[PDB]
Amino acid sequence: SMNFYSAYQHGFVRVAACTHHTTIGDPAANAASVLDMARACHDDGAALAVFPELTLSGYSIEDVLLQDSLLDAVEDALLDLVTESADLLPVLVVGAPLRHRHRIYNTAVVIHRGAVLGVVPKSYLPTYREFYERRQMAPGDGERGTIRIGGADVAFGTDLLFAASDLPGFVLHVEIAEDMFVPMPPSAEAALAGATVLANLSGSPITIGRAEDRRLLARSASARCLAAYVYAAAGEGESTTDLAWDGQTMIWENGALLAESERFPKGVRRSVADVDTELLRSERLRMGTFDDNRRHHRELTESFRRIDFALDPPAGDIGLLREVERFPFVPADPQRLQQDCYEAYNIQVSGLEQRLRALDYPKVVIGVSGGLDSTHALIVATHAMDREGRPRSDILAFALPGNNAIKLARALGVTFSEIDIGDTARLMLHTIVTFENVQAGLRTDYLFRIANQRGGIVLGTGDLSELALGWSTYGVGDQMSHYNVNAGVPKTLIQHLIRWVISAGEFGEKVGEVLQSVLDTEITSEAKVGPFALQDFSLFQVLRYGFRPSKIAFLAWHAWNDAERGNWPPGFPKSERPSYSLAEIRHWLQIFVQRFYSFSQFKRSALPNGPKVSHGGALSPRGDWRAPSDMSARIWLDQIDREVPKG
């Protein structure tokens, strides 16, 4: 029933930061650039278009700001833009010097569908180094009430929110340039009062290092305020009597850069991106201290004035202007991925180290199959022992048949032994896929018994994705161990941790050759539960954000349906770059929500210790995931039936 391909119906809001062509001291010309860009934003289906500080006059005109003809021309141009907006989709946020009471104010005028919703004055006017703003303009901090524009009294002040009544996830707040650089910025109080999209109009003459400063402050605002931050600075056309300009625009969301434009461009530029209002909503739902901070500042935050507007956004397929990683646990960017792998590995190792110290260095018993998970756990166990100054021969590795394993153990210098469970199984199957659980259980039973006998503990090797799907023999089974270093690591990341270890090369070339052989042999269960690439994608969206299934399918389809779009991490030869149809994503998603929400929780409910690894979450019922073991997944399956097309 929803239009599945509509970004607006999935909770996105399309927003634009625009750098126009400045004609200093010519408001009709600045307005014609603005209108042209605003029409491009309309054609793109954008809900918001933010322009540079003092758009209609030029930022850089100093005492010209005070000339009656300049100020009159700004009013005439502004009113003409307002009439134009009757036919434009986006809210426009346009800068203007405007008269109010005794002075002119440096303002952002918020315009929508033929009306002015509000006028927001800059709160802090720098008057130091290259800035002289208090000479021409009055501070807006603490100003409230209304301003008279074109025959209407409209809201004026630095306490205004603009809330889309048909898009509750979109609540706009506006501030100007210096306002975001002070210790207590107006946007931070507005975020706590309910703003989700924070706009900044900037003039910002460019000097060496200044772009880094803008980025630092806008990025950290977006993170600390669990918000999108939409920034536009002035560019070509501002006076270069004493100053230069780079026209930078950028869009941040919760600390992530969604889009940015060319610095020092020839001609106008825009950043345009779909902000996920549900991502912002999900972060604020979970981070309770955000709301405790609002309650601490209740008087400050409860008094904002909320001005309502109806956006009436396009209902159809307008694409999705957003990078959606195929692997939420495996960043495509190589530098970022190296860092993640470094971090995961040390998490795993230091976790195990603390366990070994607290137990006065037991021997470590571990089942090794030659598979990715147990290969990597053995490497972790080895490094933990090395760092604790303990002999590698205190590692007791067991192959348990019902290849690369013995090679790897021999290359590491750990104690390797191979017990054949075939026979004990047989006497079991007699005294009482059955076949295949008896084996799994007898593996575990043995490992524990040897650990008892040898003064050791059992290290587990099962991974987070297996925990998510309940892929595991419950009880006496592979979940059970004294400490599982892989419990927090999703299957999709495991191969990269191994690659990272090989690249490290800190184990020497023989060990690297065996690990490489493991990767080559294992990479090329997924037949029952489907591709781990898709199941790890849904696990992240559910565990981090609680997104509904149709939202997850939509993100997954944009990431995965076309192998040529987007980016792939390192380690994917062209031939190993699969693409998935919506029918496939839908199928594996029905299996995901059933197994995750309903079937699998009981198996997780009694997990072994092991460290949390991913910022996306782990599944410890002592930690990130508290849930009932006895619930149906009916509503999630029904949501898929209702909202995700069959193909």
Toward a copy of itself, which CB reaches closer, 28 or 504? 28
User: Is residue 80 close enough to count as binding a copy of itself by CB under 8 A?
Assistant: no
Residues 478-497 close enough to bind a copy of itself by CB under 8 A: 480-482
Q: Among residues 20 and 407, whose Cβ is nearest to a copy of itself?
A: 20
**Are 568 and 324 contacting, i.e. CB atoms less than 8 angstroms apart?**
no
Q: Mark 308-347 with x for binding to a copy of itself (rule: CB under 8 A) and - for no binding.
A: --------------------------------x--xx-xx
* CA–CA dist 200, 185 (Å, integer): 11
Q: Does 565 bind a copy of itself (CB under 8 A)?
A: no
Residues 6+ apart with CB under 8 A from 74: 27, 56, 57, 96, 97, 98
Site for a copy of itself in 525-544 (CB under 8 A): 542
Distance CA 223, CA 256 (A): 8
Beta bridge partners of 232: 201, 249
- Buried b / exposed e along 129-139 (16+ C-beta atoms within 10 A): eeeebeebbbb
Among 578, 634, 641, 647, binds a copy of itself (CB under 8 A): 634
Give the CB-side neighbour count of residue 413, counting CA atoms within 13 A: 10
In the structure encoding, which two tokens stand for residue 281, read together?
């909503």
Between CA 12 and CA 33 the distance in angstroms is 27
- Spatial separation of the C-alpha atoms in residues 136 and 522, rounded to whole Å: 70
CA distance 244 to 79: 30
Cα dist. 447→358, 458, 613 in Å?
A: 21, 7, 26
User: Least Å distance between CB 93 and a copy of itself?
Assistant: 21
Which region, judged by CB under 8 A, interacts with a copy of itself, from 60-68, 109-117, 504-512, 521-529?
60-68
Separation of alpha carbons 293 and 631, rounded Å: 34
Sheet holding 395-399, edge to edge: 415-418, 395-399, 363-367, 456-460, 483-484
In the complex, what is the shortest distance from the CB of residue 491 to a copy of itself, in angstroms, rounded to a whole number?
A: 15
- Contact residue for a copy of itself among 13, 499, 620, 644 (CB under 8 A): 620
DSSP state of 313: -
Whether 134 contacts 168, CB under 8 Å: no
Q: Which of 288, 335, 360, 524: binder of a copy of itself (CB under 8 A)? A: 288
Specify the stretch interacting with a copy of itself by CB under 8 A; choose among 82-90, 287-295, 375-383, 561-569: 287-295
Q: Which parts of 31-50 interact with a copy of itself (CB under 8 A)? A: none
Site string for a copy of itself, 426-465 (x = CB under 8 A): -xx--xx-x--xx--xx-xxx-xxx-xx----x-------
Site for a copy of itself in 214-253 (CB under 8 A): 216-217, 219-220, 223-226, 236-246
Nearer to a copy of itself among residue 45 and residue 611 (C-beta): 611
Stretches 47-55, 211-219, 312-320, 519-527: which one binds a copy of itself (CB under 8 A)?
Answer: 211-219
Shortest separation between residue 40's beta carbon and a copy of itself, angstroms: 23
Pick between residue 434 and residue 575 the one whose CB is nearest to a copy of itself.
434
Binding positions for a copy of itself, 105-134, rule CB under 8 A:
123-130, 132, 134
- Please, what is the minimum distance in Å from the beta carbon of residue 130 to a copy of itself? 5
Is residue 631 a contact residue for a copy of itself (CB under 8 A)?
Answer: yes
Q: Does 26 bind a copy of itself (CB under 8 A)?
A: yes
386 belongs to the binding site for a copy of itself (CB under 8 A): no
Minimum gap (Å) between residue 563 Cβ and a copy of itself? 26
For the record, the structure tokens of 458 come out as: 């059992």
Stretch touching a copy of itself by CB under 8 A, among 48-56, 83-91, 473-481, 530-538? 473-481
Q: Are 65 and 59 in contact (CB under 8 A)?
A: no
Among 507, 537, 540, 547, binds a copy of itself (CB under 8 A): 547
- Please say whether the beta carbons of 405 and 555 come within 8 A: no
Size of the site for a copy of itself (CB under 8 A): 185
Query: Based on CB atoms, which residue is closest to a copy of itself, 623 or 645?
Result: 623
The DSSP element (H or E) to which 174 belongs, if any, is strand 171-176
The yes or no reply on residue 20 touching a copy of itself (CB under 8 A) is: no
Per CB under 8 A, 140 contacts a copy of itself: no
Exactly one of 34, 191, 273, 497 binds a copy of itself (CB under 8 A); that residue is 191
Alpha-carbon Rg of the chain, whole angstroms?
30
* Residue of 7, 17, 24, 559 that binds a copy of itself (CB under 8 A): 24
| Residues in region 573-602 near a copy of itself by CB under 8 A | 597, 602
Neighbours of 532 (CB within 10 A): 23
Query: Which residues have C-beta within 8 Å of that of residue 50, sequence separation ≥ 6?
Result: 15, 16, 17, 18, 93, 174, 199, 200, 201, 230, 231, 232
Quick one: 42 or 219, whose CB is closer to a copy of itself? 219
Q: Does 285 bind a copy of itself (CB under 8 A)?
A: yes
Site for a copy of itself in 159-178 (CB under 8 A): 168, 178
Tokens 């910025």 correspond to what residue? 185
- Write the single-letter amino acid at 391: P
CB 29 to a copy of itself: min, Å: 8
Residues 388-417 that bind a copy of itself (CB under 8 A): none
Residue 443 beta carbon to a copy of itself: minimum distance, rounded to whole angstroms = 10
For residue 402, give the nearest of 433, 373, 436 by alpha carbon.
Answer: 436
SS3 state at 596: helix
CB atoms closer than 10 angstroms to residue 200: 30
295 binds a copy of itself (CB under 8 A): yes
Q: Shortest Cβ distance from residue 537 to a copy of itself (Å)? A: 16
Q: Which helix (H) or strand (E) holds 225?
A: none
642 near a copy of itself, judged by CB under 8 A:
no
The C-alpha atoms of residue 126 and residue 179 are separated, in whole angstroms, by 10
- Point out which span in 191-199, 312-320, 498-506, 580-588 binds a copy of itself (CB under 8 A): 191-199
For the record, the structure tokens of 596 come out as 């995750």
